[PDB]
Write a protein that binds this ligand. Sequence first.
Ligand SMILES: Nc1nc2c(ncn2[C@@H]2O[C@H](COP(=O)(O)OP(=O)(O)OP(O)(O)=S)[C@@H](O)[C@H]2O)c(=O)[nH]1
Ligand SMILES: Nc1nc2c(ncn2[C@@H]2O[C@H](COP(=O)(O)OP(=O)(O)O)[C@@H](O)[C@H]2O)c(=O)[nH]1
Ligand SMILES: Nc1nc2c(ncn2[C@@H]2O[C@H](COP(=O)(O)OP(=O)(O)O)[C@@H](O)[C@H]2O)c(=O)[nH]1
Ligand SMILES: [Mg+2]
Ligand SMILES: [Mg+2]
Ligand SMILES: [Mg+2]
Lengths: 414, 392, 390, 392
Amino acid sequence: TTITLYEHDEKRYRDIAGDKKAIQDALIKLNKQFKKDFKKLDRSEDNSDTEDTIDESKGVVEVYANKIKARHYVGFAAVDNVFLQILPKVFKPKEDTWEPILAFIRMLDMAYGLKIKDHDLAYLQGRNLRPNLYEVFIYLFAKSLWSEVQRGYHREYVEVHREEKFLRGKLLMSRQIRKLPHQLNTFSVEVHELIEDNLLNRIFYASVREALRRTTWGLNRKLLGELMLAFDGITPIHLRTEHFERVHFTRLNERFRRPFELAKLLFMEVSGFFVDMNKLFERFIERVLVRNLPPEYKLFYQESYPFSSQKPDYVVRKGNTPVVVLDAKYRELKERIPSSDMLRQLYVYSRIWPAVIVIPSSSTYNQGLPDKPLEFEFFDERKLFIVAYNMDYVKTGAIFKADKNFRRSLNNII
Amino acid sequence: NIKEDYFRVDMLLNKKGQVILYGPPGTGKTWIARKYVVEETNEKTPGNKWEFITFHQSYSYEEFIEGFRPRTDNEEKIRYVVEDGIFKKIALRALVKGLFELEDATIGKDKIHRLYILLTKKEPLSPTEYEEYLRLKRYLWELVGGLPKDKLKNLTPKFYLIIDEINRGNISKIFGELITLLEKDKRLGGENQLIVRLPYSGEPFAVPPNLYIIGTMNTADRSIALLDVALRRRFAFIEVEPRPEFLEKENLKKIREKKLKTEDRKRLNEKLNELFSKLGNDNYFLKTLLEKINVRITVVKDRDHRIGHSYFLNVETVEDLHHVWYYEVLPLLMEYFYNDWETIKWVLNEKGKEHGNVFFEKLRLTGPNGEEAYQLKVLEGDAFIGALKRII
Amino acid sequence: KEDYFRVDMLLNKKGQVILYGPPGTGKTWIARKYVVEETNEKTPGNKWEFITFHQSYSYEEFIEGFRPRTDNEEKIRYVVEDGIFKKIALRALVKGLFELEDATIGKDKIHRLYILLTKKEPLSPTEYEEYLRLKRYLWELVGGLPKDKLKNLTPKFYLIIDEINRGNISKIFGELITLLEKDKRLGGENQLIVRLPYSGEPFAVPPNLYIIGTMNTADRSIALLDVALRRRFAFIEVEPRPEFLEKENLKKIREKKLKTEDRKRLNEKLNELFSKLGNDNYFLKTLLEKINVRITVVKDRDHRIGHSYFLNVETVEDLHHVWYYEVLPLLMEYFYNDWETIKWVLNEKGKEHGNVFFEKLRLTGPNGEEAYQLKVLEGDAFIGALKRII
Amino acid sequence: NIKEDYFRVDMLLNKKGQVILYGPPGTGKTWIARKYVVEETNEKTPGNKWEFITFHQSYSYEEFIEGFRPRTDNEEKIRYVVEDGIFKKIALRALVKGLFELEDATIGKDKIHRLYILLTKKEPLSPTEYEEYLRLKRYLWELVGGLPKDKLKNLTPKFYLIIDEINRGNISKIFGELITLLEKDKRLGGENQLIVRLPYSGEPFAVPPNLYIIGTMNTADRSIALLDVALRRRFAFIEVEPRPEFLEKENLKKIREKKLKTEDRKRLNEKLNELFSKLGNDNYFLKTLLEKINVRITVVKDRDHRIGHSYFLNVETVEDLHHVWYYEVLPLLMEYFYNDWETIKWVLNEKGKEHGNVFFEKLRLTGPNGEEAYQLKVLEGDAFIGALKRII
Ligand SMILES: Nc1nc2c(ncn2[C@@H]2O[C@H](COP(=O)(O)OP(=O)(O)OP(O)(O)=S)[C@@H](O)[C@H]2O)c(=O)[nH]1
Ligand SMILES: Nc1nc2c(ncn2[C@@H]2O[C@H](COP(=O)(O)OP(=O)(O)O)[C@@H](O)[C@H]2O)c(=O)[nH]1
Ligand SMILES: Nc1nc2c(ncn2[C@@H]2O[C@H](COP(=O)(O)OP(=O)(O)O)[C@@H](O)[C@H]2O)c(=O)[nH]1
Ligand SMILES: [Mg+2]
Ligand SMILES: [Mg+2]
Ligand SMILES: [Mg+2]
């Protein structure tokens, strides 16, 4: 069964496909698996409460008696033929669930640091496939591999001190001089032969073999079927985490960086990955600000310690003199005013940095939308200047029209 | 319609110089290449005018052109004389056999005929005549460089070389000196005559315009990720399609009677009439079965993974069709789809069927995470024919 | 018994077979018994030859290679000595030319070759140069004989190859792997008198020599072979039959090896065995069936538990040793870093810290792992843990 | 011929010392390396003035400049001697031929002539004269140590080493010592005369300024491409783009009658007039056909996988264009886009077409999970030109 969630959204167990007992068995393994692998991913003002909440089967999904509720952890996971995918709530609409997939991967393209191509994703737009995050990241792995295997096969050179019936390469002399004449019929050479089954090819044969076994499309089954035939002579391996560390990216296999990072993102039971929606917006806004703020340079994660260090998500300073704090919040900001938890942190970030502070918030049809300019000016009775900026999201499309509107509102703010 | 396939090879082999009969296995690519050379140069065996040679994964350049090899010398201790491979024993042979018919006033025809004897010698070279072989080979490449390009295009004996399974070996490593030479222009006598200096023996070497290197590439193994520049431009690729037109009643009768004898063709007529009467009196059954199963292969997987037509070409009864479907089609079908079951039953259009007359029946015990494993099921008699009559 | 009616059919329409199957099934024993029942040679040697493969096996020991040799306590003299495959292919040729009416022109010299080819350790070069002279006469003779005389050679020779998947089959056959197709052999339609690289004498597989492989496919599947092995050969799956482990079937199998007075002791011990198991004659049949049908749905079909391990049980203590040192080591080997699926193969999932073959360790780990540990049971408690596998 | 690709090789090879003609397959890279050296040295065969070798993956460092190679003497069969490769036999040949017209070798001009005989000797060196060869070699590197740099700047011959497919071998390993000699001011006579010490023989070695190295690498493959940044400085890369301008009506008559200067110029011209008259009297058809494929390959594939102008150069008739399409470049296009059918339909500009006069017909049978694949169609006649007029 395929189940899909948006951030802070619920599904009924009666309407859902499959079995009632089957889905709740899949989740308790996933929330437990998120507990052991929680510390690998960074957060930003998450209020995670690592001791109590995550180990109570509330790590990724809150499984309840009457419904199934998603926390603010975005991504996907495939467990026990119950494929779960959690999209952001910002891309929620009012092919009907194919626009938020390419919106989320493009927000996973710019924020998280991936180097995927837009024409890789635009190939899938309109082919009426079943929307699934695991079916597209296997495709993004398989297409970027088959576009990097079609040119060259990555045959890397190792040297072997082999006793050959012929003579290839440099003849070892200290091993041939001390050769008895009863065994003179084989040369003892040290040939730098190119092997096809290197460590990077043992991984990509194993990463395809664990992908074709767990794929469900008709496009990925054809593409991984051609990749497995190209890797036919390679002896297979069992994938571990030691194999993904033992290879290093030099200049002669640098073009295999794009399929390998996606092969490390999906393989290392469980499959997939999860990230916090607060930090992914904190990373995504950081791409927008430094591009859109020419007058003043901006650094993310600068920290100033009170008295326990409370650090802004981003601060922009021209040289050192202007202190314009920019704290990225994923909150909906209901009733056109910041909440108690938000404005209390905005007060501290301005005071310990005469410092204006701007809060960027999400804006679409689903999320709360303010007017086009800088919506809310606030003073906290200390000559402060709190500006509520809102970035519109044309990221569901491929054109960046809202970046010009975000620059025009920031130019009036700067 | 096989003389056009002996003309499709023949029109490309005088224009590009060498071909590759690429196609799915069980088609006749080895048989078309072998029965074209035997029909052209009337020599039923290898050796003199053509040499059959297959490739493998551990085949190296030193076995093909030349390499240092230990060789015994008159039942005594070994020496380390450099041995010419299987190509250089026929590339030099195609030169010195063509240089008989050339009437020039500089040919050492007594010396060239002595070199031709030492090249066709089936025994290995003894050191009393190996130095006579290397000295006469030195006279050959002093003579070839002195002949003009006008007298090195019309060499009469067409030498051949059936490279079987050319994609199985590493093609760019075997053809070391033969991905700069195997063009029609880079041969001897052409406009771009190149005599390439070899690394091991140190003597210059150039392919003559007689040698045509026919290749028979299986493409269900070590697929189309080829060299794509060197081993793809030189070879004029001929697709040998798996033709189900040879699987009718008359076409199976015509194939198995021409190679047959007097008493064999009457028994092959009685056997094939018994076979197709058990199938439903369908004279076009095995054609329609192979054509239907080939369309399902080219839709799901690649178009060059189709089941060929050399398998069903040697059937005479239902029991022989059973032993070619369960040992040369269904193990071959489970090889292409990498032990998949939900798409291997759509090829037989048995996607929504289980436990009946199906070639892959579902086991009635699912796994822990809801997975299911199918199992091959042997059939017999009219149950198997009813399992074949719903593939169409 | 019934597999010998399948190998005998497939060895005529293909020419070679590979008996693949899970380890401890009968793959070596079916290949050995079929050849002995066909050629009535209880020992290897004359009409058949047994050979294993390994990772560092060579072309020099299979077909033809160089080997040193002393000449009356002198310096090392290198001589070309034929391997296993060429000594059984030339033997299948010179034995087949006895019953040919056209090969009677050299019947004395061909018979001299067959006596020389079945004897061991040719000690002097005076018969070796006689041997190389007779072999050149043999290939000069069969090169000028018609295809009708060389299609039906009477005495069939066999080559039982053990562990066909282990050897580097693209190296140890070399460029001779295209001599195994039935239309590519000697006396076929497209025959090939191909030349060997070392000694230069020609070589061709006669149509007597059938290649009965044997493939332990617990490590390497049939799709993971070399590409010139899944099409030249023809695969017979020797499935693990649990029907050889009944009360009457285990008695009939053990009745062939022992004597008459040993049989009554064998009858009394098997009556003592199955009475302790709960008076179930169908017990060891349904034990492997309830294991293998749970093995083949969580792993491949080629990872099952065979039936040669349970063919020597006489008491419960012997079955205690077989289940703990010969079968459960295989299940821990096939399921590494995975304790849940092996707990479902035994269908003991959710039951820990009792009469369980893998008890749960109390400790959890740094991040939290299950990390079970096997438990050696004994006595009636072991049968109480084996009864609930059924 | 002398306009661009000749005058920019000769200017750049005289300035840098080494030229690599990198470019996609089907372009005149081997040809412009062969034509430039033969038109310079006036020797249409290898040997004395120039040597044409080619690299591969079985090529050794020990067989290039220096290595231990076991020779076969008479009474001692296994004798391990150090044998100079092909580069040390062309670098020493370029040195001792250039040192015939010097004025500081006045004691050993007979010794330099005797050393030049031993290097031009194609016979294998007997061990009675190999020590005479080694005594003259260590006399040579004593003589250039006493030679001034003003007299080693101008050596009047011009020796060449056309290595072909340089990028195939392990170029960091083959050029062992040559990764620090191959520069214009690091040869003999340059501003930094470097005489390095070879490992095996222990004799010093330095590339003369007489030598030039014209590599022709291929850049369609990527796993063998030359990314050694310390080696790309030594060479001087010349991109030979595949020019479709050699496929016009006037250009095919000027390229094919320059080489074939026989009396068949009236035969080629009336055949090339008949070929373009069947193409709609379009004198720029094959120029437009190769241009509208190479641009459409550049945008989706890499820019170095383009179709060259050596496929369509040897066309004569529509029947010959049909042979070079369906057997050379259409299996090439199915290799670039291997079961990527929406791309290969678009490269031939048949994206919306799925029936009729088209190369790839759509199958009328879709798959289980919504996949769909196409099928070739062997066209002929004016319908084939109607399928080529849609590309341009
Ligand atoms: N006259 C003439 N012929 C050309 C020209 N360019 C290419 N050719 C022809 O192309 C043919 C082969 O081109 P070639 O240079 O050998 O390709 P290549 O460099 O070897 O291709 P690769 O496989 O190594 S990558 C030759 O027959 C030559 O006549 C040209 O500019 N003028
Ligand atoms: N008579 C006849 N036999 C054919 C034809 N095509 C194939 N065969 C048969 O196919 C068999 C050879 O198959 P082969 O070429 O080895 O298949 P492949 O090399 O794996 O592609 C021979 O036994 C032939 O009898 C044909 O056109 N005519
Ligand atoms: N009597 C008898 N013994 C069998 C049978 N099947 C297997 N065996 C035994 O199984 C053993 C052979 O196992 P083997 O095939 O070599 O296992 P492998 O290692 O996978 O090849 C022999 O010692 C036989 O005693 C059978 O049907 N009857
Ligand atoms: Mg073949
Ligand atoms: Mg065995
Ligand atoms: Mg070239």
